[PDB]
Design a protein around this ligand. Sequence first.
Ligand SMILES: [Zn+2]
Ligand SMILES: [Zn+2]
Lengths: 386, 50, 144, 64, 113, 232
Amino acid sequence: MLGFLSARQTGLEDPLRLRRAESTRRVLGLELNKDRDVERIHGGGINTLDIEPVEGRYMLSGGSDGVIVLYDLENSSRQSYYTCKAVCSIGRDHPDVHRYSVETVQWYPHDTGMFTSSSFDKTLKVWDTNTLQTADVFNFEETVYSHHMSPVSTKHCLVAVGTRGPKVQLCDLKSGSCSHILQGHRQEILAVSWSPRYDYILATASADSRVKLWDVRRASGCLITLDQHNGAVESANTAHNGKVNGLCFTSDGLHLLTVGTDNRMRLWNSSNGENTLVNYGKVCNNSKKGLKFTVSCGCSSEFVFVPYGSTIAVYTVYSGEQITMLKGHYKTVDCCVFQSNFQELYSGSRDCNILAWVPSLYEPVPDDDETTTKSQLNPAFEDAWS
Amino acid sequence: AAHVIAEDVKLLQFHVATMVDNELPGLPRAMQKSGRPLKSLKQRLKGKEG
Amino acid sequence: MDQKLSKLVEELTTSGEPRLNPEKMKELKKICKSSEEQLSRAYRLLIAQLTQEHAEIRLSAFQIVEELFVRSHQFRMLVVSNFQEFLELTLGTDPAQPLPPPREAAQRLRQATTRAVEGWNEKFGEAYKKLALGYHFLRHNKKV
Amino acid sequence: LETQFTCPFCNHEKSCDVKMDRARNTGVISCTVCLEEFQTPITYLSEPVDVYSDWIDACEAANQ
Amino acid sequence: VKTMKVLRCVCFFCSKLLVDSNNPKIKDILAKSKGQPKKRLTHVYDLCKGKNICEGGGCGRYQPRIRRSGLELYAEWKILLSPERVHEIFKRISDEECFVLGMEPRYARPEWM
Amino acid sequence: HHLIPETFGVPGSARAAVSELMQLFPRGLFEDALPPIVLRSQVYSLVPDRTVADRQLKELQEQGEIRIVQLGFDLDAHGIIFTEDYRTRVLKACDGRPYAGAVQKFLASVLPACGDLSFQQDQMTQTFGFRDSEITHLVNAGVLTVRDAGSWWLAVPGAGRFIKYFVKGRQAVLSMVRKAKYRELLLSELLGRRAPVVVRLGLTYHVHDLIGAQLVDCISTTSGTLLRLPET
Ligand SMILES: [Zn+2]
Ligand SMILES: [Zn+2]
């Protein structure tokens, strides 16, 4: 540390280096609930989490109960230990509440005043955050597994919806259009994800074992089908020997991660679909529904956090190296989300907990001359062989 | 859509089937208008009158 | 060393007794106290012994775990690090992996585990976060 | 009678199966999509549809 | 019914017989069933019905568990078995192998069904 | 030395690994009819960095040193075979057989030029000029097996004997760990134990597979390497 501080003060190293090094060290030090609980509002499993992109203060949660909960993550108490309290909820008393489990919540990418929700009740809903009233509602023939709004598109406001139907659907919130379908897939579409680099490029994953990249401006059909063997454009390509149930672009958009029920994670070049041949080993993935997982941002290494049964596995994206297993939950983890500002990970599970994983690099320090106001050696940490 | 083409191949299969045998156990009879069943090639060949 | 640990944990867990032999358990405690490496191998032995398809071996190994959990921080850390599997092995929270026969020993194991875990929750759960989560999971979500 | 049911939580059709553990007089219904599970006491007269009905009733009882 | 029976008698991948033609238990059939093709098929079928692996020569690949429902076939892993590709595997059965199925290929190759 | 090491708290080649594993293969068990097969899993037991292993294997494929074949008994079941063994054994098996000329054509044309695990009918018909009857000759030879209509895996003749022995041996050797005390077994003790009659391919070959497939965890001990069933 003191070396980094000296090098920064003297301009020997760019201020980038201390910042990225310490961010990486913090990710390596994640510990369960060290400073922080999250308030138990849900009665069911936590299907989905989304941290607000503007300030990172607020987290939406959706669950198998159909409830949507909005949490405040900032410690506005003066204590070193605190609870992330629920600001407000769309509970079962609300008229517009979802009838069946809520499978994706996403903030509007450009300000916090609106958010979107989807559910196995075959709806996509648009919510006014200040009032928690729906502004628009879209209905579908089939249960929605996933939806996404483009994180970078200013030009268009399209929601991609993946359903049990074989056709991807696109809803235009500006016009209210929901007629536009993409017709290339053959089974249920389990994950959809817009490129963070390009306004118009949508990745889609399906139980047909295919990941397809689309340019939604075109009348032409899809661009690229990912072939895990690298050899041919559509006739037989598969990304996994199983269902493909999760997508995550890397934070630069240059690669796409995919996870599937073959228990493998695979890294792809997003500009042409080449399998980069990074091998992570067995990544346990039994999930028959979409799996949400996340990369880090702003670290010296790009990490990926992936549900691994009841654990969260951490890998280095490019090296394939398994770094740690975060070992908290009692049932399968369904989502995790990364707070980029402070390198804190939140995780939802079918055990109904939301758990915070927080960098725990060192303890509060005593003064040895104190009587009892020290940083206490609690007797729970003591042996008792007598 | 895959389920439409599945249902259409299923219907083609049913018609090619009822051309040879219109006395299948677990499927509806092929019929003319006014509802009379069609005579298949099997019923042409089968019985004492066949 | 390791052979003595092996023989002690066999003679304790093949015993079929309703309670531990105090002298052999004193020897096991002495070994565990003598080396973190041997305590770690004792944990890895007992968790494996708790897999045995016979309820009296599970009951014996659980009684050893209960005796050691009160007595070392490192053993508490180890046990709590796998508490999900431990509870599957000792309360049968997974209906695909139920407790083995006999029922008469399984009822002893289940009661003793419930009592022990509630005691550990009161004595340690505020320090071991995953233990308090486990207790809540039992009480509210498996409705124990 | 039907022995496979629509999940009350995830709305997937024919996603729930019943395991009749007669020896312990208990019945477990489990959804393969969301792994929500419910346990009810069963009698020798009891059948999969009685376990499913008990689960739907317990769900509507929890909505109160 | 013949389609189902022949599928249970050949490798779903290499289209060789699911039992060794050279085995004494099949040379028994080929002696005791000359000119009796239906008898050949019946005795080859009741040998093959218990196999699950192509080793018996052979590839190593496991085999399905086909079941009829009306006019549909289900291949156990629940794949509904297409008539195409059933054409493909039948197309690759050798004339010597289908002769042991009792299907003289000069007159009734199985893919023609 | 004084800044970069502070950034975070965190050599056998695939060619060497393949060449070592290839000697564990019992050639006489198959009358040498099979070319020696090494599984991709076993390579990861000697080259623990799976990414480096896979990339070096891909480079050996591009030099044409090795063939990768899908063995179908599991999703990841890839056999690694030296091209010259494969070519020699297949030509020796084809001598005077009726499919022989198409197999000579395949080994003279497709395999020198393609690394693929599978071929589609478009390539086979138009790029390499195979007649549809020649694909039938290749399937009779065992060099292809039907993947799907108009598509085929590259295969090894007689792989069923190996695959049978491997699948049963794998379950046997894994049960030797499962049944031993604590589910623990020291590797030196296992390799010293009289192998089951089920374990026909040899016991070291299987421990390298099991370790590479992550079916067993190695734990290092003062007593040496210890096998365990993984917490999974
Ligand atoms: Zn469900
Ligand atoms: Zn075969």
